[PDB]
Design a binder for this molecule. Structure first.
Ligand SMILES: *[C@@H]1O[C@H](CO)[C@@H](O[C@@H]2O[C@H](CO)[C@@H](O[C@@H]3O[C@H](CO[C@H]4O[C@H](CO[C@H]5O[C@H](CO)[C@@H](O)[C@H](O)[C@@H]5O)[C@@H](O)[C@H](O[C@H]5O[C@H](CO)[C@@H](O)[C@H](O)[C@@H]5O)[C@@H]4O)[C@@H](O)[C@H](O[C@H]4O[C@H](CO)[C@@H](O)[C@H](O)[C@@H]4O[C@H]4O[C@H](CO)[C@@H](O)[C@H](O)[C@@H]4O[C@H]4O[C@H](CO)[C@@H](O)[C@H](O)[C@@H]4O)[C@@H]3O)[C@H](O)[C@H]2NC(C)=O)[C@H](O)[C@H]1NC(C)=O
Ligand SMILES: *[C@@H]1O[C@H](CO)[C@@H](O[C@@H]2O[C@H](CO)[C@@H](O[C@@H]3O[C@H](CO[C@H]4O[C@H](CO[C@H]5O[C@H](CO)[C@@H](O)[C@H](O)[C@@H]5O)[C@@H](O)[C@H](O[C@H]5O[C@H](CO)[C@@H](O)[C@H](O)[C@@H]5O)[C@@H]4O)[C@@H](O)[C@H](O[C@H]4O[C@H](CO)[C@@H](O)[C@H](O)[C@@H]4O[C@H]4O[C@H](CO)[C@@H](O)[C@H](O)[C@@H]4O[C@H]4O[C@H](CO)[C@@H](O)[C@H](O)[C@@H]4O)[C@@H]3O)[C@H](O)[C@H]2NC(C)=O)[C@H](O)[C@H]1NC(C)=O
Ligand SMILES: *[C@@H]1O[C@H](CO)[C@@H](O[C@@H]2O[C@H](CO)[C@@H](O[C@@H]3O[C@H](CO[C@H]4O[C@H](CO[C@H]5O[C@H](CO)[C@@H](O)[C@H](O)[C@@H]5O)[C@@H](O)[C@H](O[C@H]5O[C@H](CO)[C@@H](O)[C@H](O)[C@@H]5O)[C@@H]4O)[C@@H](O)[C@H](O[C@H]4O[C@H](CO)[C@@H](O)[C@H](O)[C@@H]4O[C@H]4O[C@H](CO)[C@@H](O)[C@H](O)[C@@H]4O[C@H]4O[C@H](CO)[C@@H](O)[C@H](O)[C@@H]4O)[C@@H]3O)[C@H](O)[C@H]2NC(C)=O)[C@H](O)[C@H]1NC(C)=O
Ligand SMILES: *[C@@H]1O[C@H](CO)[C@@H](O[C@@H]2O[C@H](CO)[C@@H](O[C@@H]3O[C@H](CO[C@H]4O[C@H](CO[C@H]5O[C@H](CO)[C@@H](O)[C@H](O)[C@@H]5O)[C@@H](O)[C@H](O[C@H]5O[C@H](CO)[C@@H](O)[C@H](O)[C@@H]5O)[C@@H]4O)[C@@H](O)[C@H](O[C@H]4O[C@H](CO)[C@@H](O)[C@H](O)[C@@H]4O[C@H]4O[C@H](CO)[C@@H](O)[C@H](O)[C@@H]4O[C@H]4O[C@H](CO)[C@@H](O)[C@H](O)[C@@H]4O)[C@@H]3O)[C@H](O)[C@H]2NC(C)=O)[C@H](O)[C@H]1NC(C)=O
Ligand SMILES: CCC(CC)O[C@@H]1C=C(C(=O)O)C[C@H](N)[C@H]1NC(C)=O
Ligand SMILES: CCC(CC)O[C@@H]1C=C(C(=O)O)C[C@H](N)[C@H]1NC(C)=O
Ligand SMILES: CCC(CC)O[C@@H]1C=C(C(=O)O)C[C@H](N)[C@H]1NC(C)=O
Ligand SMILES: [Ca+2]
Ligand SMILES: [Ca+2]
Ligand SMILES: [Ca+2]
Ligand SMILES: [Ca+2]
Ligand SMILES: [Ca+2]
Lengths: 388, 388, 388, 388
């Protein structure tokens, strides 16, 4: 096997087709499904799998009580076959911890899990299913990373981490790994003022990450990484189509180099594909809560501060719960271009549905089509009353 | 691996032997078995598997309530090891949707799943477990396909789809795929007036599909496909042994080029092997309901409008529930001829057994013998009262 | 891979060591374990597995009620990893039916399952996990076979079948298979008057089967097969150490060519290793019921009508339930000799334990040692009161 | 594959990072998790797995009652994927018995399980998943072994066994195996007065075992084995940092060649890494019970009778239950040195938590870092009240 190189561009995105869906919460009402959150999707050369952070209990288990909580000793990064649910019996543990990323470099997979108390967390970098490198907290305040796949180019897999305040300036670092070893790291540069939970994809030897400004911004910060030079830039999506949550209503002119204000100290992980006219943004439909999900085609969103939608697709109705969302692609597919994909975490339980004592999610995932396909909506599908 | 070619003829069918049976409904009374319907069987070069459309819940799960319904966002094409039940933990998801087909071309497998609302459905064609092609609804009325295996020849895998009314003229298309790409499609031609749910098999470089005329016909339409020329014909089985359900009583002369009338706007998926004197037809024993199942040897059924049975075999007693049935063969077996096989879907629950709130099925499957074997009957075997 | 040849002799048997044990009934009290009976063990070149006839329900399932019954449409030959229990999720179905045998020829495995009603049963012979040959009932009275592994030599795998009365003369046949095809069959010859359920092993190009004379004999019939010549002999074990069940008390002189009388129309599957002074016989400890199990070293049991034990080993106490027992060996092990092995079926439930409505078993299995090892006893270990 | 050679030294241990954790007791509250104790970890060249002695029942099963008991016929050595729980459906049985060890020699794995009654136990040595050698009890008093991984060098895998009193002189033997055969055995020599449950690791062609003096010593005996010469020495850890449990308070001067007295006839399996200044000792935090766990860096512990800690790491708080602990390494990892690893058995249930009727455990495991990482604590995490 050789290291994968990002030699292709994105396929033209004219619509999105259904790729995977696990129905985990429906199925786990009566089967041994692990409680999760922070899911994602990631491909190896021969298989694509679902990933998430387990809470180390089943949904129906008494230990599901309290699983709104983020960072326990009972969490792990797990993977499981595409569109199956994360069960006790089919879930493979990649590493232990409560914040993660993972990617395949074409030879083997790197997985990163962070664990520890808030003031003393550490990353362990796994390569070829063995621990290779460890990184201690630099700011002693919840060292944390992407919660979706990283991307590699010629063996170099950049990863974005943050350590420090979630509601103020923090210390974000881009690490450049190869075979699980640190080649280099850099502090965040450019005009993004706060970075969380980057969602990344690669094309033509450039990695683009769309992140969450949890501090001030309802526009999303974007980091663009050159994995050969091992350098990067940052800015915000210029478009007035604002894509964090919660957020203010859309203005007519956005901000390229500044957080678009109105909402502080909150957000949600999200993603975009930023490719000139072939630009699509995901967001919650609601401006107030993690409900609904839609894709909007917003030509030149990254660079055009008045760019508005020219096309769209509803993924999840506004009357259904959504959650995190992130990018991945099958870098090992056939053909001449990389097909954009994404997932949405469909959160069930607390805090929105507090008649149950748990928090979990299921997954829906879609990839782009060059057709203009009909749209459906893809809810979680579980009846919460069944769990009472 | 090279593409499989249909170089052999059918083995002489003198009786049917038991091939597989999953007992899914019996076993799922107390284990984590998924609710299904629309099952089938399909072989790879090294393994044969059961397939079906999951309902995204277990039988015993509270989400089983309402699973009579056909087309939800919670359905997927699943496969699982031959004669095992479709469990949460052993079922592999092929694609998401509520109508499907799948076949192996000798190199890898193509799987097709259709999803969406009634007026905006789309097919996604998977090849080598990756999405390759998408097809939008052309008639905006429940785009839909075979619900059993397709067949390939030298890499060309024809698939029959219908879009439009189920009770009137519709727009049926034969698509010719290779490596998940569209080579060609053609509208239905010939004298079949309505096509649903084709059941196909191949021999000597010809693919024969027996389908369901849901509109007017209680004789079954037959499509015969030349996968080299990528052309086809259609007609009806001429025999007065009528093989849809519900149906009128058997006449003494059938119809070759016209629906045999008497029952409108209903049917059931079924199959036949049409091979001169080596012709066997499957049907429900009941003319009114999906109960019982039998095979009848009906020499020259396709072409002889007075052909009557010369031999038969009971598969399921008339006092037991049946369901859909379809053809498959192990194209990769040893020997000089292709052994005809079929499955029967043994539907349990609604609408016939409405003391439960679910609908599911198990599978029985048989292949032909050159012996004249003794017959048994093969019911589902679950006691519905246990589920109350 | 080449066909295995029986080139080695038996290892000297000085005691028996524990080989496998599944604890199935203990574990299935609270996990999804299939009801079984008629278990055995059989090796492939790279793995040894447990086998049995499923009843197509879990123990705890409501469908367990009635599983004393032998021959339903819901039974199948299953295999599963050594010493695991037969679960819904780990059990591989080899074929469908209610009487079986299976063996690996060094290239691939042959599995045979018989199904049907009593007057119309048929064997299907599977090779390389595909059906190849079918055999119809010749006597129309419960066509049936070994219920333990067959043995192969240079691709020829003899199998013993019986069809006809269980309490009178019947029609026993030795079939010689190769690649699942019939080379030859012969009717039983020699002085055994009735044959059931043969337990076989091979050494130095001879296959020895110890069987059950269900009609008149409490000594066990022995068939010895030359798989090159495809010929056989039969007689009884001459020893007065009688090894069927139920049985009369041991006399001082047995019978070589005649059933030893006293008990009619009953028996149990069992086995022996017949190798001159290296001869060991298994039997129930009880003369009346399937309770206890012991191995006795009985030099020249086959040929010496006064041979008595010189050594022994208790396997199951007389205060614990036993069941069927049978021979197998790992023909693909290292070293200079074939290590004798056996299993005992530990039957629980009906008819002996009729406060439950089911019948099932677990498995214990032992292989020979050239040491003189200490003995333990190996009960099933489940508490029946837990299942009430 | 070639036999692994112990060519590398230990990596510098500056802290410990989380490696694996199964959360078995939390998860098994509502899934089919086997009851275990005596767990460990062991690597093959391509995978690292958890191991333990099953009790042949699930936690939630009624057969969990009585599982404080050590030596039943229902126990087996099982392995399962790293950080998964030991479930009915994912656990592979290595051999049957109630005391074990296992190691991979670079070509294949050797597994040893001892079974039998107290006065007549026997070891079966498995190699390449087949039984090869058997050893009968020599002292007729609970023949028993390591309960953690053995280590191999050029195919020679030494194993320590004890037979005889647990509270007095016993007969300890070092066996040297290759391909599951006995090359040699030696009686214990040197100044260790009693040996139980050795925990071993290899580096630079030397194997170091830290064991449990159950009779008189609260310092741990150490056996050092030359696997080329097939010879060994024994002594005690000289350090006054005493590491058995229960134990007296730490003195200021320990004992090199004598048990450090104060506590008799009890202990716990434990481990150390003894590598000059790079020496780390594990122990319970409590001197009275199996509660808490910590690692202490104790330069020259083996040889310096006044050596005290220079660094440490808390693994399990003193308010949480611990248990056995043992060493393993991934001998097949990349890089220039062997990374020290260990596990801790987190015992739940009896005798400490006697409102439940069972005894089980989960596993936590850590490996060394050359960083100085932040510490967390890693409890079992189950709420016992949930099981009432
Ligand atoms: C079968 O399935 C097919 C395929 O899915 C279905 O067809 C799809 O139908 C949907 C639903 O209609 C479409 O999605 C919407 O797309 C529009 C964009 O397209 C419109 O606008 C285009 C651009 O117009 C401008 O520029 C052009 C030139 O470039 C100029 O010509 C024009 O005059 C104008 O200045 C038009 O080009 C486009 O027309 C084309 O397509 C038409 C078909 O759609 C066709 O009829 C025409 O002939 C022509 O070919 C069309 O007019 C998106 O704008 C829209 O998204 C907005 O609306 C939804 C609610 O519906 C909302 O959730 C979105 O967030 C977004 O609106 C919010 O954000 C805006 C931006 O800031 C803001 O301006 C809005 O006020 C609004 O803001 C509020 O809500 C947000 C969210 O809660 C909040 O944050 C704010 O604060 C505020 O509160 C949809 O995405 C698909 O594109 C369409 N697909 C295809 C291929 O056709 C079909 O319907 C299905 N069939 C059936 C039978 O069901
Ligand atoms: C051990 O197992 C073995 C193997 O399975 C069992 O043996 C099997 O036994 C079964 C049951 O008997 C057989 O199935 C039936 O087969 C007949 C066909 O064979 C008969 O007819 C043949 C053709 O006769 C005509 O042509 C020949 C020349 O070609 C001419 O010679 C003759 O005079 C005549 O004109 C005969 O050749 C054949 O004889 C041969 O075999 C005999 C053994 O069976 C033997 O005795 C002879 O010596 C000779 O060798 C024999 O007479 C099928 O017709 C039949 O199917 C009809 O009946 C069932 C109900 O039983 C029904 O469900 C079917 O749908 C079908 O009848 C319906 O459809 C007809 C066609 O339209 C219609 O005409 C009928 O009125 C009827 O219609 C009604 O019901 C349907 C369905 O609900 C409904 O839709 C309509 O509207 C209407 O209401 C069975 O398939 C096996 O062939 C046989 N197999 C073998 C190899 O022998 C054996 O019994 C078992 N042993 C034990 C002890 O149990
Ligand atoms: C640690 O583990 C070790 C290893 O397992 C344990 O040691 C084992 O201990 C057991 C139990 O004692 C032994 O099993 C029994 O073995 C005897 C056979 O050995 C005896 O007889 C030998 C032959 O004697 C004759 O010939 C020799 C010359 O060849 C001649 O020298 C002699 O005078 C005589 O004519 C002796 O050689 C042998 O001695 C040797 O070994 C001794 C140790 O055992 C040692 O002390 C000596 O120094 C010497 O080296 C010894 O005397 C079997 O006969 C016996 O089986 C019978 O009894 C059991 C009940 O215990 C029964 O279930 C069996 O079915 C069988 O008896 C039935 O069948 C007989 C045959 O028809 C019949 O005659 C009996 O009346 C009886 O029949 C009744 O019951 C059956 C069954 O219900 C029913 O069907 C009938 O109708 C009727 O009702 C046991 O198998 C092991 O061999 C032994 N192993 C080893 C290697 O030592 C050790 O005990 C454990 N340690 C501890 C501390 O527990
Ligand atoms: C973020 O995470 C990081 C990384 O984990 C956390 O930092 C870690 O913090 C912990 C907790 O403090 C440290 O663990 C302890 O380490 C000490 C050893 O280090 C001390 O001593 C060193 C040696 O001192 C001696 O020699 C030097 C020269 O070699 C000489 O200079 C000196 O004067 C003296 O003679 C010092 O070098 C060392 O200083 C260095 O590090 C300091 C940071 O820790 C730093 O401040 C300094 O500048 C300098 O660089 C330091 O002083 C262990 O001794 C200690 O273990 C004892 O205590 C615990 C309870 O805490 C107990 O459980 C242990 O068993 C042990 O004490 C028992 O055993 C002793 C030996 O027999 C006995 O003497 C004691 O009385 C006691 O015995 C009793 O209990 C036992 C157990 O129940 C019982 O059996 C007996 O019978 C009796 O009842 C801890 O292991 C880590 O080393 C440290 N790691 C790092 C890299 O810094 C950080 O805190 C986290 N951050 C936050 C914000 O939480
Ligand atoms: C700690 C700040 C961080 C990003 C703002 O919080 C995240 C927010 C989350 C959220 O908004 O749902 C859930 C994440 N599991 C959590 N991350 C961690 C590591 O706890
Ligand atoms: C039909 C006669 C035969 C041997 C005597 O009966 C066997 C006895 C059995 C028994 O004695 O326990 C159980 C077997 N499952 C049964 N075989 C079949 C095929 O039903
Ligand atoms: C028999 C003595 C031995 C070591 C002291 O006892 C061990 C103590 C144990 C303990 O201290 O927890 C549990 C072990 N399972 C047990 N070993 C066996 C084989 O029973
Ligand atoms: Ca924000
Ligand atoms: Ca019809
Ligand atoms: Ca008998
Ligand atoms: Ca359950
Ligand atoms: Ca001690």
């Amino acid at each position: 096997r050789d290291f994968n190189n990002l030699t292709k561009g994105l396929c033209t995105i004219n619509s999105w087709h259904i790729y995977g869906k696990d129905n985990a919460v429906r199925i786990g009402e009566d089967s041994d499904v692990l409680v999760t959150r922070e899911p994602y999707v990631s491909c190896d050369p021969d298989e694509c799998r679902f990933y998430a952070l387990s809470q180390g209990t089943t949904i129906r288990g008494k230990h599901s009580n309290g699983t709104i909580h983020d960072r326990s000793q009972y969490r792990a990064l797990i993977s499981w076959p595409l569109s199956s649910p994360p069960t006790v019996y089919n879930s493979r543990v990649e590493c232990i911890g409560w914040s993660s990323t993972s990617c395949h470099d074409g030879k083997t997979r790197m997985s990163i899990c962070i664990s520890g108390p808030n003031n003393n967390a550490s990353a362990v970098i796994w390569y070829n299913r063995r621990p290779v490198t460890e990184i201690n907290t630099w700011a002693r305040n919840i060292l944390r990373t992407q919660e979706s796949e990283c991307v590699c180019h010629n063996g170099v897999c950049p990863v974005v981490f943050t350590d420090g305040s979630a509601t103020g300036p923090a210390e974000t670092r881009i690490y450049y790994f190869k075979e699980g070893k640190i080649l280099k790291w850099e502090p965040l540069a450019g005009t993004a003022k706060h970075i969380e939970e980057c969602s990344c994809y690669g094309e033509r030897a450039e990695i683009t990450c769309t992140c969450r400004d949890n501090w001030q911004g309802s526009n999303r910060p974007v980091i663009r990484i050159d994995p050969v030079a091992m350098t990067h830039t940052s800015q915000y999506i210029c478009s007035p189509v604002l894509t964090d949550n919660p957020r203010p209503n859309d203005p007519t002119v956005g901000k390229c180099n500044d957080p678009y204000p109105g909402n502080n100290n909150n957000g949600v992980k999200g993603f975009s594909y930023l490719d000139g006219v072939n630009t699509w943004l995901g967001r919650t439909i609601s401006i107030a809560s993690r409900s609904g999900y839609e894709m909007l085609k917003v030509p030149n969103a990254l660079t055009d501060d008045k760019s508005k939608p020219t096309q769209g697709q509803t993924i999840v109705l506004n009357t259904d719960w959504s959650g995190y969302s992130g990018s991945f692609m099958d870098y090992w597919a056939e053909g001449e271009c990389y097909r954009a994909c994404f997932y949405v975490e469909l959160i069930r339980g607390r805090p929105k549905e507090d008649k149950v004592w748990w928090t979990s999610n299921s997954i829906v995932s879609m990839c782009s089509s060059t057709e203009f396909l009909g749209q459906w909506d893809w809810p979680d599908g579980a009846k919460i009353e069944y769990f009472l």
